[PDB]
DNA sequence: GCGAAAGACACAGATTTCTCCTTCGCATATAGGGATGCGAAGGAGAAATCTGTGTCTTTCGCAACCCTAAACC
């Protein structure tokens, strides 16, 4: 059970929680930031009410989802210095990069990994998870959700 | 992931112009008559150019953000 814990912690009633559930994807603000040089960048950040519940959510799933030890980003007691200590004594180096990394994660691929780990979750928790950690750009009938960046749970 | 407003890509078909194709009318170098050769217009039927419509590509200043310093995504 997961929806019960979130309801109890924030002392939400039935009607209020349901109202927030189906309007959560649109509570985002889109803005531009200057670039070092010439140009601009696009950011989208949620409201205060949705942020402090997203942070609470990630606390429950932190001790249940394994993460490989070769990833040195958004990890406790890890930084750039530990990243550069691996290649500090080698001659030839090759570097690569992805393409639009953060908007290629969708609930279709997210739930597939959850099923493979052996954890079984109820359908209500699936609905709660799908409508809370994801963003819906465009019109209300787009029916497309992207993880986005700038949210406390994406990294 | 993608607003509005203009281009690119692929497939038809239409049309004016040019070029190939009869039909006969001179012609002229051999004393009139006959023959080989070429010029003149209608009437085709072919071909380059243009124009039409329908399917996607790019990417916004997009109700709804914080105000302490440095680096990365």
**Distance, angstroms, CA A50 to C1' B64?**
11
Q: Which residues 63-82 of A interface with strand B at a CB distance below 7 A?
A: 73, 80
Q: Are the CB atoms for A44 and A29 separated by under 8 Å?
A: yes
Q: Find and give the residue nearest to B62, measured CA to C1'.
A: A30
Measured torsion, CA atoms of residues A144, A147, A153, A155, in degrees rounded to the nearest 10: 170
By C1' distance from the Cα of A32, the closest nucleotide is B61
Collect all residues with Cβ–Cβ distance below 8 Å to A148 and sequence separation of at least 6: A28, A44, A102, A103, A134, A135, A154
Task: Tell the burial category of A105 from Cβ atoms under 10 Å away from its Cβ (0-12, 13-18, 19+).
Answer: middle
Q: Does at least one atom of strand B sit less than 7 Å from the CB of A142?
A: yes
Q: Are A150 and A45 in contact (CB under 8 A)?
A: yes
Please indicate the experimental technique that yielded this structure.
cryo-EM
Distance A142 CA to B55 C1' (A): 21
């Amino acid at each position: 059970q997961l929806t019960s814990k979130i309801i109890s912690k924030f002392n939400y009633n039935r009607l209020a929680f349901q109202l927030l559930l189906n309007e959560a994807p649109k509570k985002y603000k889109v803005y531009y930031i200057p670039k070092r040089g010439a140009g601009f960048r696009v950011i989208a950040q949620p409201t205060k009410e949705l942020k402090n519940v997203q942070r609470f959510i990630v606390s429950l799933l932190q001790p249940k989802l394994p993460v490989h030890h070769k990833a040195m980003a958004y990890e406790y007691k890890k930084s750039i210095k530990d990243n550069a200590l691996l290649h500090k004594d080698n001659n030839y180096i090759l570097k690569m990069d992805f393409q639009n990394f953060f908007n290629k994660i969708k609930p279709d691929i997210f739930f597939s990994k959850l099923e493979n780990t052996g954890l079984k979750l109820d359908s209500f928790d699936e609905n709660t998870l799908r409508n809370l950690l994801f963003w819906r750009p465009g019109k209300k009938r787009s029916t497309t959700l992207i993880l986005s960046v700038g949210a406390p749970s994406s990294p």
